[PDB]
Amino acid sequence: FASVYAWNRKRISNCVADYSVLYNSTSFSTFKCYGVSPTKLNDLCFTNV
Amino acid sequence: YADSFVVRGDEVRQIAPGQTGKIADYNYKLPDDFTGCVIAWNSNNLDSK
Numbered sequence A: 001f002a003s004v005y006a007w008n009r010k011r012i013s014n015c016v017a018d019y020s021v022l023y024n025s026t027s028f029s030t031f032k033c034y035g036v037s038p039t040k041l042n043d044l045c046f047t048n049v
Numbered sequence B: 001y002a003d004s005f006v007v008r009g010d011e012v013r014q015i016a017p018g019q020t021g022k023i024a025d026y027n028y029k030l031p032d033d034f035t036g037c038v039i040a041w042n043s044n045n046l047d048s049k
């Protein structure tokens, strides 16, 4: 992973966002969304990720 | 009524209305119009061997 001052940016396109494949792999300590409700993420499409 | 169970330390944040994740999706769900209180505490001295 990069350093905080020289942080990295990556582009994501042409993919299916099924975040249930992370359940057995990862454990998260912080998850917060701002402009959208977390229960509506399975029903949307995203533009310029 | 009183409900009791055990989870990880990183999964306490999911016991709240409007949350997503493995625990909220498949294990334990709360209503949107919930009236009550939520309590949690560490239990390492008893539940770990």
Ligand SMILES: *[C@@H]1O[C@H](CO)[C@@H](O)[C@H](O)[C@H]1NC(C)=O
Residues within 6 Å of the ligand: A024
């Ligand atoms: C989930 O991950 C654990 C640990 O890597 C592994 O033992 C288990 O087989 C995995 N379960 C599935 C369904 O892949």
Ligand SMILES: *[C@@H]1O[C@H](CO)[C@@H](O)[C@H](O)[C@H]1NC(C)=O
Residues within 6 Å of the ligand: A025, A026
């Ligand atoms: C990251 O990917 C490797 C395989 O390249 C896998 O062994 C490892 O468990 C993954 N780590 C997580 C936490 O997803």
